Amino acid sequence: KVAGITQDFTDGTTTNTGRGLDVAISQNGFFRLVDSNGSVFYSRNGQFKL
Amino acid sequence: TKDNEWAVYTHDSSDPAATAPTTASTTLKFNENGILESGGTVNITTGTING
Amino acid sequence: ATAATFSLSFLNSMQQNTGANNIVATNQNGYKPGDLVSYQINNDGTVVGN
Amino acid sequence: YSNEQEQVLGQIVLANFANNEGLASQGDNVWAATQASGVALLGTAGSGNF
């Protein structure tokens, strides 16, 4: 059988880039976004816009 | 216009001989629990074209 | 709108020198209206619509 | 601002779950919380276990 796809949730390399609107997270935690429909999602990829 | 009252106006867009709207068609009035209460049915005539 | 009156309870609190002040958990049972976007079936047999 | 004033516009909210490996990958670099993960448990970047 196939029980499930598991994911390795360890954080990785912190790489500097020098932009202004770029955030990273050093430990546990997720950014929290809403969509156009009101669905609430969670993320780790910090690269924003305007 | 005010809280829990709206006014709907009509226009006939597919013909150029339409009267300019000077009188609103009808008012809609609500509850304070957001439910429609009064003035929801109205008899409207269109314009005419091609006979 | 009809004004909301509600019973507010500070139960299960403590005063025991926990560094600074902090808020652990707030809960209330009201919601603005919405629409259905998805449904699913969990493992215990419950149909859950978000 | 241009009259030597500072204005806060909001604070970025982190959130973490009591159970990972229960999140569902839902497209792009984006997850989604369901059953077998729990409630959101959201806060700020300083205190807690964030």
Curated annotation (Swiss-Prot), chain B:
It comes from the Bacteria. Coiled coil: none annotated. It is found in: Bacterial flagellum basal body. Signal peptide: none annotated. Belongs to the flagella basal body rod proteins family. This is Flagellar hook protein FlgE. The chain holds residues 203 to 253 of 403 of the full protein.
